[PDB]
């Protein structure tokens, strides 16, 4: 019987613990048990209640230690013995969290059996030193043509993704992961990015959809989803990015590369606010704790491209901050903006105007740029940066009697903009990013009618595969366009454009 087996598991619990420090709750209100005892407690100790609830001890006051319950008050009551686990917070880190959805504790919320991990390591551990860190010579490709060229991203690099609420905020992040399937397949472990998605706030239904999408694209087989859902408690939410980072350290330390996407740190902030006000800890700007900055800075500097003495490895990061009204002035955005090296700022008007991704290039920046950009892609997109700049300015001069020069800009500009639009959940290879942009740059497609851009694009890709998938493979493998390749590429484009 199901009952007999369940009892058999309970029957095997009968060990007694001569608890060196025991405490007894004096009063528990607000999820802030104030416990009498626990003199040998180390700060941020994991403590196990009579209810079995786990906690941390943010306030160590002399007579009482105000434990913060990771659990719920429903199962907690006064007078309760509060056993001291006596070990500061640690989470399993190791290899086998690939394709595994876990909560912060490290318990699988997908419940795909016990976690495979090599150690449990503390999550309050610090960031790599200055000397233990060396430059980002590595690019990374998300499969989004604009992102990879206009805002080229690297590995061990942290760059913000600050944008309008859930307007494919999750979609932008997921796109990278899909192109990372290609790279993951790729043997080199600088190209085997073992991605970590940290779903903060996001409810279990929403994350279930994410999970389903990820399973559908088979992305789970390098993905890790640290999940702190809406139902999951605010201490768990608070420690969730810190915890996630620790998993990443194992990869980084192993010299491998990986990408951790904290989505959204804004909801992490709210949890810290909730905690602080309940612990009577000082509130601060925008009623967020004053040292919320200190948290974010610690977290985001752990991510980094290590020195080559440090086994040449990294933890790429791409934090996501959700701007509720595009308020970059907001305290949590301003802080993060300084810490981060780059921002991507999606604009709502563009979203409404059906540009999905709704990315606004003006307010998107990369501060590492061509160090982490493919040479081929750099060549054929310097022009693109300048062209788009003109198009933006001359977009507002689109409103009667207008010079031929202005009109040329408009034709080239509208067509380019249309070219950089991409349907959601379509990643691409760099070897196909380079041709399309080259064509647009040379204005072959700027000649082609706006309506016909889309059909041309797909046709061009097939045409390129037919005419010279040798060229495409060469572009992929050489990575640097020779004058001969640019000649040959131009010829192919010309041939295609004529049809």
């Amino acid at each position: 019987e199901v009952s007999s087996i369940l009892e058999e598991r309970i029957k095997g619990v009968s060990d007694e613990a001569n608890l060196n420090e025991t405490g007894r709750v004096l009063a528990v209100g607000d999820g802030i048990a104030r416990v009498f005892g626990l003199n040998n407690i180390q700060a941020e100790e994991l403590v196990e209640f009579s209810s079995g609830v786990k906690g941390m001890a943010l306030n160590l006051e002399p007579g009482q230690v105000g434990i913060v319950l990771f659990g719920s008050d429903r199962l907690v009551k006064e007078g309760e013995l509060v056993k001291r686990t006596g070990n500061i917070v640690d989470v399993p880190v190791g290899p086998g969290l690939l394709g595994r959805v876990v909560d912060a504790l490290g318990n699988p919320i997908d419940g795909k059996g016990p976690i495979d991990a090599a150690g449990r390591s503390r999550a309050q551990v610090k960031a790599p030193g200055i000397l233990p860190r060396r430059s980002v010579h590595e690019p990374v490709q998300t499969g989004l043509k604009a992102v990879d060229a206009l805002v080229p991203i690297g590995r061990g690099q942290r760059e913000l993704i600050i944008g309008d609420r859930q307007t494919g905020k999750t979609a932008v992040a997921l796109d990278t992961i899909l192109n990372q399937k290609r790279w993951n397949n790729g043997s080199d472990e600088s190209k085997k990015l073992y991605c970590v998605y940290v779903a903060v706030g996001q409810k279990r239904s929403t994350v279930a959809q994410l999970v389903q999408t990820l399973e559908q694209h088979d992305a789970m087989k390098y993905s890790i989803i640290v999940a702190a859902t809406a139902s999951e408690a605010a201490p768990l939410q608070y420690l969730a990015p810190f915890t996630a980072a620790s998993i990443g350290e194992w990869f980084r330390d192993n010299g491998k590369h990986a990408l951790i996407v904290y989505d959204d740190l804004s909801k992490q902030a709210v949890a810290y606010r909730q905690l602080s006000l309940l612990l009577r800890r000082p509130p601060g700007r925008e009623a967020y704790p004053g040292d919320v900055f200190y948290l974010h800075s610690r977290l985001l500097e752990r991510a980094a491209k290590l020195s080559e003495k440090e086994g040449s490895g990294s933890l790429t990061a791409l934090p996501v901050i959700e701007t509720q009204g595009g308020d970059v002035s907001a305290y949590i955005p301003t802080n993060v903006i300084s810490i981060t090296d780059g921002q991507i700022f999606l604009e709502a008007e563009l979203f409404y105007k059906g540009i999905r991704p709704a990315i606004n290039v003006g307010l998107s920046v990369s501060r590492v740029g061509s160090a982490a950009q493919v040479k081929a892609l750099k060549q054929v997109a310097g022009s693109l940066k300048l062209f788009l700049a003109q198009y933006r300015e001359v977009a507002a001069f689109a409103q009667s009697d207008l010079d031929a020069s202005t009109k040329q800009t408009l034709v080239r500009g509208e067509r380019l903009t249309q070219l950089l639009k991409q349907n959601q959940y379509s990643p691409l290879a760099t070897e196909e990013q380079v041709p399309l942009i080259y064509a647009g740059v040379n204005g072959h497609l700027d000649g082609i009618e706006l309506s016909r851009i889309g059909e041309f694009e797909s046709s061009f890709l097939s045409y390129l595969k037919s005419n010279h998938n040798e060229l495409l493979t060469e572009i992929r493998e050489k990575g640097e366009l020779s004058k001969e390749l640019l000649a040959s590429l131009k010829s192919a484009t010309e041939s295609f454009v004529a049809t």
Binding site: S3, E16, N18
Partner: protein, 50 residues
Amino acid sequence: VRYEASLRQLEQRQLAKSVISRVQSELGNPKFQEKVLQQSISEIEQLLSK
């Protein structure tokens, strides 16, 4: 099929209250004396093993 499955769940909760009935039986029995004594000596042995 739905109530058939439900009856199984209802049975687990029925058997839960039957466990509670058995808890009262244990506490009625001089298992209350004898197994408490068993716990006492076991705790002595445990505490000696410290």
